[PDB]
Amino acid sequence: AFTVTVPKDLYVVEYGSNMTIECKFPVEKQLDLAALIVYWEMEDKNIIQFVHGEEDLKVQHSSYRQRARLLKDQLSLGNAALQITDVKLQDAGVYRCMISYGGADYKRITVKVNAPYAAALEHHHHH
Amino acid sequence: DPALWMCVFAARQCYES
Ligand SMILES: *CC(=O)Nc1ccc(NC(=O)C*)cc1
Numbered sequence: 001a002f003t004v005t006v007p008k009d010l011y012v013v014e015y016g017s018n019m020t021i022e023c024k025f026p027v028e029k030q031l032d033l034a035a036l037i038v039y040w041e042m043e044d045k046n047i048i049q050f051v052h053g054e055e056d057l058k059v060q061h062s063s064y065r066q067r068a069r070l071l072k073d074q075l076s077l078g079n080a081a082l083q084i085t086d087v088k089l090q091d092a093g094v095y096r097c098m099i100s101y102g103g104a105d106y107k108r109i110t111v112k113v114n115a116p117y118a119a120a121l122e123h124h125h126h127h
Numbered sequence: 128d129p130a131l132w133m134c135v136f137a138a139r140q141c142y143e144s
Contacts, residue, residue: 037129039136046136059140104128 002026002103011111013087020071020083021109023097027078035101038070040082042095042111048082063090089113 005024013019033053040048045061048070055070064084071081080097092113098106 037132039129039132041136044139046139049133049136051133059136061139061143098129098132100129 002101002105004097004099004105004107006097006107006109009107009109011109013111013113015089015113015115016086018083018085019087019091019111020081021095021111022082023080023099023107023109025078025080025099025101025105027076027101031076032101036075037100038075038080039098040068040070040080040095041098042091043093047095050080063088087113 003026007022007024011019011021036050036052038048038050039046045063046059047061047064047068049056049059050070057065060068067086068082068084071079071083074081080099082095082097084091092111095109095111096106097109098104
C-alpha cells in the first residue's frame with residue numbers, strides 16, 4: 001500500500017537551535033502537486049496544511065508562525081521535511097505527519113527540548 | 128483520512144481565534 005516512514009522517531013534538540021524532522025513517502029519520477037496533501041500536527045496544534053502547492057498560513061497555530069515551514073524542494077524526493085527554527089520548550093511533544101499522495105498514511109515522532117549544558121552548570125553551582 | 132484531517136484542522140483553527 002501507500003506507506004509513510006520516518007528515518008527516526010525521536011529527536012533530541014537543544015533549546016534555541018533549529019530542527020528538521022522528516023517523513024518519507026513514495027514519489028516516482030516527477031511529483032504531481034495536484035494529488036499531494038501534507039499535514040503536520042503536534043499535540044493539539046496545527047503546524048502545516050499543504051494542499052495542492054499552497055500552504056494556508058491562516059490554519060497554522062500562532063506559536064509556529066514565521067517559525068515553522070515545510071521544505072518544498074525536499075518534497076520532490078518524497079521527503080516531507082518540517083523545519084522549526086529557534087525551538088522553544090513548548091515544542092517538545094509528539095508530532096505527527098499525515099500525507100496523501102494516492103493513498104494516505106501517517107507516522108508519529110517524539111521531540112524533546114532540553115536546556116544547554118551551561119544551564120545544568122549554573123544549577124550545579126547551587127550544589 | 129485527508130478529509131478527516133482537514134476537518135480537525137478546520138475545527139482547531141476556528142477554536143484558536
Ligand atoms: C469536515 C469539516 O470541515 N468540519 C468542520 C467543523 C467545524 C468548523 N469550523 C469551526 O469550528 C469554527 C469547520 C469545519
